[PDB]
Amino acid sequence: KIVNIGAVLSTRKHEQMFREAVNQANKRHGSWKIQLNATSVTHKPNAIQMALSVCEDLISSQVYAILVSHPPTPNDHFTPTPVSYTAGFYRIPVLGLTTRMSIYSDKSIHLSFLRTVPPYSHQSSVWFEMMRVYSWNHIILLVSDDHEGRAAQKRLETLLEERESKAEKVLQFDPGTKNVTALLMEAKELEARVIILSASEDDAATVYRAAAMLNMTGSGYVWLVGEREISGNALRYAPDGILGLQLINGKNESAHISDAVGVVAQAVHELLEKENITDPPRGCVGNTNIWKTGPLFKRVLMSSKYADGVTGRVEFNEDGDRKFANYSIMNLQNRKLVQVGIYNGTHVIPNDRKIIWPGGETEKPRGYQMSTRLK
Amino acid sequence: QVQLVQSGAEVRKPGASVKVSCRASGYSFTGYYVHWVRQAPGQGLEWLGWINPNTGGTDYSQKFQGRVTMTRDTSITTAYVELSSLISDDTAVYYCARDATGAASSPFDYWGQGTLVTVSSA
Amino acid sequence: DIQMTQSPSTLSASVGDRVTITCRASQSISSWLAWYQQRPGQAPKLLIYMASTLQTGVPSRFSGSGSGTEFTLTISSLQPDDFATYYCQHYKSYSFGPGTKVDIKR
Amino acid sequence: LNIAVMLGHSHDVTERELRTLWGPEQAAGLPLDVNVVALLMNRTDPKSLITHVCDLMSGARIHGLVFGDDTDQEAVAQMLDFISSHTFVPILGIHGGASMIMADKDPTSTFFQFGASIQQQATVMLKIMQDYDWHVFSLVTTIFPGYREFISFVKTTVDNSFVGWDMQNVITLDTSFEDAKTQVQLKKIHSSVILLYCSKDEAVLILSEARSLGLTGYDFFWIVPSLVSGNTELIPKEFPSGLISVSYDDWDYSLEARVRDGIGILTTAASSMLEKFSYIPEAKASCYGQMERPEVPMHTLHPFMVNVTWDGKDLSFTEEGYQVHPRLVVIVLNKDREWEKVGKWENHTLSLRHAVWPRYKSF
Amino acid sequence: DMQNVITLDTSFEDAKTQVQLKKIHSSVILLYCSKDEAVLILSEARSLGL
Ligand SMILES: *[C@@H]1O[C@H](CO)[C@@H](O)[C@H](O)[C@H]1NC(C)=O
Ligand SMILES: *[C@@H]1O[C@H](CO)[C@@H](O)[C@H](O)[C@H]1NC(C)=O
Ligand SMILES: *[C@@H]1O[C@H](CO)[C@@H](O)[C@H](O)[C@H]1NC(C)=O
Ligand SMILES: *[C@@H]1O[C@H](CO)[C@@H](O)[C@H](O)[C@H]1NC(C)=O
């Protein structure tokens, strides 16, 4: 009765401290045998080298789950796709630590991928909650033409159609285009002036520059900005009055690992105590049979829910994303991020700090407005 | 020198809350577990739980769940345990012991002098 | 979990007499058992860890044997300071037995 | 210039290599001769696949990869997409595990599969229902990945069509084997045509529930997607007679024909690239060893494979990577507990049917 | 406007009961059965929106 867990972590010191955390998890009184063995490997820049290392080290060591964290370089995407596909070939579940990309939500691509961090598409729920409390009846979405962007747009439309309301129009941006002046010019002649932005950092900076040069950041306009579109170079181009979102300790790898090790330990205990199980294949070479207990492990992970984590209660939906996550509403004042609101799930609680708006106005502006110029 | 210092004897009415401290010196406080074991008179040792100062992880016995709270402070290397809903059977002596981190072959190498808690209606 | 049973409940012997304590667990625990000595009004002291190796500073008279579910504590010569209660505890259950107390025969 | 093809163990490697080599030699001679390298393996584990790909990379700079499979594992499609997304070598899917087109292709990837996505399977089923004059609708669905987009697509199609199907309440199952609210949801529909959307085991469970609830009569018509009836050789007892579905098998095609078509597609793409640009494409020197972010200095093959004609067969591909005109043969469950071809859709995106209506026997 | 009379062949059948109960589209339904039979019929019809 030996259960092994693999880990793909950014730095050696993090690997050692998380192995120590796994050992501490093994110090529980209800655990007897070796239910959590610690194996770690650094993120190799080469994709096929990483796949070979995983196939030769983790799968060969009878891993029940693999933990993959953020790459050491946030500038590069460095997606965990190479290990996710290999794990999904054998139906071996994985627990993404801080992978916020909205590509693994669909399990038809990543069969056995799970993550404890909500994706960028999940911010549509927070946007809907903010709209329901600030009376943003009319909205306009500026979303780039990307799979993450398409998923976010679909989720936003699905949540908005519940109130029998729809956005005026939706514009698509190419992933890397520069001449976005026409889209903003045609979006200016709209009754609604509450803009939600969902794009990349460079695209967000380009949109900010285009709005600044077209005087689109004046009084009355409200800009809703996600987590990705404020971080990085956007701080040097975002105008005042940005209503941005930020994930509480979202990039904190230590807390996510500490929660994930306990969650996976409890899941392993439940799976072992549930019924008869099938051992993982000893070698990754020459075997074309999926794990029989893989779907059962995924089901028990989905059904798992524990509040012992330092980041609040940890639970997974049918799409493998965290439910009831904590968001912090950030308002850009004097080119500095100010925490002005919190989001504990389906509820927005503003703080005592005043909320400024683009154009220098302090009073809360209206949303949809008329121009009395009817074509 | 490895030494453990606890609080003095306390008497509390039933249904109240009692807090017991445990100060460690002479070794890495974060690098060793702190385990709390009680012993009623005329009865053997009874285990309550343990706290890891390095990560703050708290483990509690299923019998004592919902009443035992353990906190640690790295700045002063002191551990505190809080117990609520005291009953007449909770009158015992509480000891804090040291356990090695990662190694599972050194059970309670050192023991403190112990703290006596008396629960009565007088 | 795992329940620890100690036998005999009470043992009385003269000074220098051999002392044998038998402790049994509910199921197999391999060799993860430890023996403690606790005098009345005093904190417990660890004598043998892992039931095979003696703790540093413990007199050589104490010895441990057994494996699996049955473990035996053996004292070659009883001493006046050895009149205390002995407990057997498993590592990953933190469960202590009822305790065997050595008293002067009378 | 060089194409490497990997097949299964069903037939002999030498004959397949010879016929693939002689394929393009029949007609439409390329300006530069192209050779075919054939490999045979009994296993398709990811490490073996990537090692074979790297070995083929050193094989005189293989430009195109054709992969054949004999197993039912669909993760090989994801593995091929991952390989093509970081090696810049186009990969073409043939019959086997790679035919299950379900994942969203990476924009930087160059993976194209001969299989038909469920997006066009929905249109084929709608056309079949039009041919049967079935203007009533019912969607009994379960929580399965990639089905919300299909539900949205079919809702938009029915809402934006002149046929005007009677779209009743859509049944979305909360979880499989619930046995608590599933019966109420299945009994809340009184229609005649049901388009199921779930996995094979979930399909069997739902059909058993319908049998218990008496929803398998003469007037009840059940239509299921390709993945439900993917294994045509395995017919569970819970499937009633007359079960209409779509699939793609060797009834009208063959593995040799499919690999020959893939070779022709690769040759035509190479010829188009040579005609538009005098530069000759070349494979990467090393398999994957790089010290910096990958980049493509030359033009990719995507613009050169959107309008392709092969001796009268236009096997073009869309932006996603699926065929514009897939076979997607429509089949029904015959009274002998076996699947029988009843229609085809490849003909100019039109459905030609044998017109056999009373196939719902009371077995 | 009398419609087709629905008769329950066997108690707790749960197979032919549903198809017979789907034939009636009227707003008024009469019953002729025992107390437990009436309870089970109402339980079956509650899921049918009747
Ligand atoms: C546990 O993981 C380590 C990796 O540090 C490995 O060397 C060892 O063989 C593993 N043990 C088992 C029983 O899998
Ligand atoms: C992560 O959180 C822990 C406690 O929750 C804290 O000690 C640590 O400083 C945090 N790290 C970062 C980078 O925020
Ligand atoms: C979110 O934050 C609030 C207050 O900051 C806290 O009460 C709540 O528990 C947090 N959410 C979770 C899931 O812990
Ligand atoms: C969020 O907090 C509000 C007020 O504190 C409370 O009414 C609501 O139930 C909370 N929601 C969640 C999901 O905790």
Side-chain angles (χ1 to χ4, degrees), chain B residues 81-109:
Chain B
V81 52
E82 188 272 345
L83 178 57
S84 300
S85 300
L86 298 179
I87 62 180
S88 300
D89 299 70
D90 292 332
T91 301
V93 188
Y94 300 90
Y95 312 89
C96 53
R98 178 187 62 172
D99 189 84
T101 299
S105 59
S106 61
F108 311 144
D109 51 6

Short mmCIF file of all heavy atoms in Angstrom, two decimals, chain B residues 81-109:
data_model
loop_
_atom_site.label_atom_id
_atom_site.label_comp_id
_atom_site.label_asym_id
_atom_site.label_seq_id
_atom_site.Cartn_x
_atom_site.Cartn_y
_atom_site.Cartn_z
N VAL B 81 -2.35 26.34 23.11
CA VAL B 81 -3.46 25.43 22.85
C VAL B 81 -4.68 25.92 23.63
O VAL B 81 -4.57 26.24 24.83
CB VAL B 81 -3.11 23.97 23.23
CG1 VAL B 81 -2.56 23.89 24.64
CG2 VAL B 81 -4.33 23.07 23.06
N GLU B 82 -5.82 26.01 22.96
CA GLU B 82 -7.06 26.46 23.56
C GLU B 82 -8.08 25.33 23.51
O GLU B 82 -8.31 24.74 22.45
CB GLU B 82 -7.60 27.71 22.85
CG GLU B 82 -8.80 28.36 23.52
CD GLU B 82 -10.12 27.77 23.08
OE1 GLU B 82 -10.15 27.07 22.05
OE2 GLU B 82 -11.14 28.02 23.76
N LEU B 83 -8.69 25.04 24.66
CA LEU B 83 -9.71 24.00 24.77
C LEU B 83 -10.98 24.61 25.35
O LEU B 83 -10.93 25.31 26.36
CB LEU B 83 -9.22 22.85 25.65
CG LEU B 83 -10.21 21.71 25.90
CD1 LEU B 83 -10.67 21.10 24.58
CD2 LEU B 83 -9.60 20.65 26.80
N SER B 84 -12.11 24.33 24.71
CA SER B 84 -13.40 24.85 25.12
C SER B 84 -14.31 23.70 25.55
O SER B 84 -13.99 22.53 25.36
CB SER B 84 -14.06 25.66 23.99
OG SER B 84 -13.25 26.76 23.62
N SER B 85 -15.45 24.07 26.13
CA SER B 85 -16.46 23.12 26.61
C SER B 85 -15.85 22.12 27.59
O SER B 85 -15.91 20.90 27.42
CB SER B 85 -17.13 22.40 25.43
OG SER B 85 -17.77 23.32 24.57
N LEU B 86 -15.24 22.67 28.64
CA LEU B 86 -14.60 21.84 29.66
C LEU B 86 -15.64 21.05 30.44
O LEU B 86 -16.72 21.55 30.76
CB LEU B 86 -13.79 22.71 30.62
CG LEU B 86 -12.62 23.49 30.01
CD1 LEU B 86 -11.91 24.31 31.07
CD2 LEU B 86 -11.65 22.54 29.33
N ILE B 87 -15.31 19.79 30.73
CA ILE B 87 -16.16 18.90 31.51
C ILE B 87 -15.36 18.36 32.68
O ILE B 87 -14.16 18.60 32.80
CB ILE B 87 -16.74 17.75 30.67
CG1 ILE B 87 -15.60 16.87 30.12
CG2 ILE B 87 -17.60 18.28 29.53
CD1 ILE B 87 -16.08 15.70 29.28
N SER B 88 -16.05 17.63 33.56
CA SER B 88 -15.39 17.07 34.73
C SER B 88 -14.32 16.05 34.35
O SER B 88 -13.36 15.84 35.10
CB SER B 88 -16.42 16.42 35.66
OG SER B 88 -17.38 17.37 36.10
N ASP B 89 -14.45 15.43 33.18
CA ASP B 89 -13.47 14.46 32.71
C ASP B 89 -12.23 15.11 32.10
O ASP B 89 -11.26 14.40 31.83
CB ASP B 89 -14.10 13.51 31.69
CG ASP B 89 -15.26 12.72 32.27
OD1 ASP B 89 -16.32 13.32 32.54
OD2 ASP B 89 -15.11 11.49 32.46
N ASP B 90 -12.25 16.42 31.89
CA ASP B 90 -11.11 17.12 31.30
C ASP B 90 -10.04 17.49 32.32
O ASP B 90 -9.00 18.03 31.93
CB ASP B 90 -11.59 18.38 30.58
CG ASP B 90 -12.42 18.07 29.35
OD1 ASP B 90 -12.22 16.99 28.75
OD2 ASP B 90 -13.27 18.91 28.98
N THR B 91 -10.26 17.21 33.60
CA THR B 91 -9.26 17.49 34.63
C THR B 91 -8.07 16.56 34.44
O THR B 91 -8.15 15.37 34.75
CB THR B 91 -9.87 17.33 36.02
OG1 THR B 91 -10.97 18.22 36.17
CG2 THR B 91 -8.83 17.63 37.09
N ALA B 92 -6.97 17.10 33.92
CA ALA B 92 -5.79 16.31 33.60
C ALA B 92 -4.59 17.23 33.54
O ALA B 92 -4.70 18.45 33.73
CB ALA B 92 -5.98 15.54 32.29
N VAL B 93 -3.42 16.64 33.28
CA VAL B 93 -2.17 17.37 33.13
C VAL B 93 -1.77 17.33 31.67
O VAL B 93 -1.70 16.24 31.07
CB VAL B 93 -1.06 16.79 34.03
CG1 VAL B 93 0.16 17.69 34.01
CG2 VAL B 93 -1.57 16.60 35.45
N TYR B 94 -1.49 18.49 31.09
CA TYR B 94 -1.17 18.61 29.68
C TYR B 94 0.33 18.80 29.50
O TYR B 94 0.95 19.63 30.19
CB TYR B 94 -1.92 19.78 29.04
CG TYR B 94 -3.43 19.65 29.12
CD1 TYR B 94 -4.14 20.16 30.20
CD2 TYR B 94 -4.14 19.02 28.11
CE1 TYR B 94 -5.51 20.04 30.28
CE2 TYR B 94 -5.52 18.89 28.18
CZ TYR B 94 -6.20 19.40 29.26
OH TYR B 94 -7.56 19.28 29.33
N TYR B 95 0.92 18.03 28.59
CA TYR B 95 2.35 18.08 28.31
C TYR B 95 2.57 18.39 26.84
O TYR B 95 1.84 17.89 25.97
CB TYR B 95 3.03 16.75 28.66
CG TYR B 95 2.67 16.19 30.02
CD1 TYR B 95 1.58 15.35 30.19
CD2 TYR B 95 3.44 16.50 31.14
CE1 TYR B 95 1.26 14.84 31.43
CE2 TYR B 95 3.13 15.99 32.38
CZ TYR B 95 2.03 15.16 32.53
OH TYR B 95 1.72 14.66 33.76
N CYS B 96 3.58 19.21 26.55
CA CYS B 96 4.01 19.48 25.19
C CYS B 96 5.35 18.82 24.95
O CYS B 96 6.27 18.95 25.76
CB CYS B 96 4.08 20.99 24.91
SG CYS B 96 5.06 21.96 26.07
N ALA B 97 5.47 18.10 23.83
CA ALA B 97 6.65 17.32 23.52
C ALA B 97 7.17 17.69 22.14
O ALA B 97 6.45 18.23 21.30
CB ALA B 97 6.37 15.81 23.58
N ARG B 98 8.45 17.39 21.91
CA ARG B 98 9.13 17.70 20.66
C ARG B 98 9.22 16.46 19.79
O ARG B 98 9.49 15.36 20.28
CB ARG B 98 10.52 18.26 20.93
CG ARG B 98 11.32 18.56 19.67
CD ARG B 98 12.75 18.96 20.00
NE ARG B 98 13.48 17.89 20.67
CZ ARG B 98 14.78 17.91 20.93
NH1 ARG B 98 15.53 18.94 20.58
NH2 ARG B 98 15.33 16.88 21.56
N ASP B 99 9.00 16.64 18.49
CA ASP B 99 9.14 15.57 17.51
C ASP B 99 9.89 16.09 16.29
O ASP B 99 9.69 17.23 15.87
CB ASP B 99 7.78 15.01 17.08
CG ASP B 99 7.90 13.77 16.23
OD1 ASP B 99 8.04 12.67 16.80
OD2 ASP B 99 7.87 13.89 14.99
N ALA B 100 10.76 15.25 15.73
CA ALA B 100 11.56 15.65 14.59
C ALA B 100 10.71 15.79 13.33
O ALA B 100 9.72 15.07 13.14
CB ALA B 100 12.69 14.64 14.34
N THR B 101 11.10 16.72 12.47
CA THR B 101 10.40 16.96 11.21
C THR B 101 10.96 16.03 10.13
O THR B 101 12.17 15.97 9.92
CB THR B 101 10.54 18.42 10.78
OG1 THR B 101 9.95 19.27 11.77
CG2 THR B 101 9.85 18.65 9.44
N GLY B 102 10.06 15.33 9.45
CA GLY B 102 10.43 14.38 8.41
C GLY B 102 10.80 13.01 8.93
O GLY B 102 10.39 12.00 8.36
N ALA B 103 11.58 12.95 10.01
CA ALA B 103 11.96 11.69 10.61
C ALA B 103 10.85 11.18 11.52
O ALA B 103 10.36 11.92 12.38
CB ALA B 103 13.27 11.84 11.39
N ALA B 104 10.46 9.92 11.33
CA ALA B 104 9.40 9.30 12.10
C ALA B 104 9.94 8.21 13.03
O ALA B 104 9.32 7.16 13.19
CB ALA B 104 8.33 8.72 11.18
N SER B 105 11.09 8.46 13.66
CA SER B 105 11.72 7.48 14.54
C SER B 105 12.13 8.08 15.88
O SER B 105 12.85 7.43 16.64
CB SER B 105 12.93 6.84 13.86
OG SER B 105 13.90 7.81 13.51
N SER B 106 11.69 9.30 16.18
CA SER B 106 12.02 9.98 17.43
C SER B 106 10.73 10.49 18.07
O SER B 106 10.43 11.69 18.01
CB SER B 106 13.01 11.12 17.20
OG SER B 106 12.47 12.10 16.34
N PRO B 107 9.95 9.61 18.70
CA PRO B 107 8.66 10.01 19.26
C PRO B 107 8.82 10.61 20.65
O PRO B 107 9.19 9.92 21.61
CB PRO B 107 7.88 8.68 19.30
CG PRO B 107 8.94 7.65 19.53
CD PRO B 107 10.22 8.17 18.89
N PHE B 108 8.53 11.90 20.77
CA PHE B 108 8.52 12.61 22.05
C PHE B 108 9.86 12.47 22.77
O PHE B 108 9.96 11.91 23.86
CB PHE B 108 7.37 12.12 22.93
CG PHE B 108 6.04 12.07 22.23
CD1 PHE B 108 5.14 11.05 22.50
CD2 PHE B 108 5.69 13.03 21.29
CE1 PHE B 108 3.91 11.00 21.86
CE2 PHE B 108 4.47 12.98 20.65
CZ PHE B 108 3.58 11.96 20.93
N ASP B 109 10.91 13.00 22.13
CA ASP B 109 12.25 12.89 22.69
C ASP B 109 12.38 13.68 23.99
O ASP B 109 13.06 13.24 24.92
CB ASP B 109 13.29 13.34 21.67
CG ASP B 109 12.97 14.71 21.08
OD1 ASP B 109 12.01 15.35 21.54
OD2 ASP B 109 13.69 15.13 20.15
#
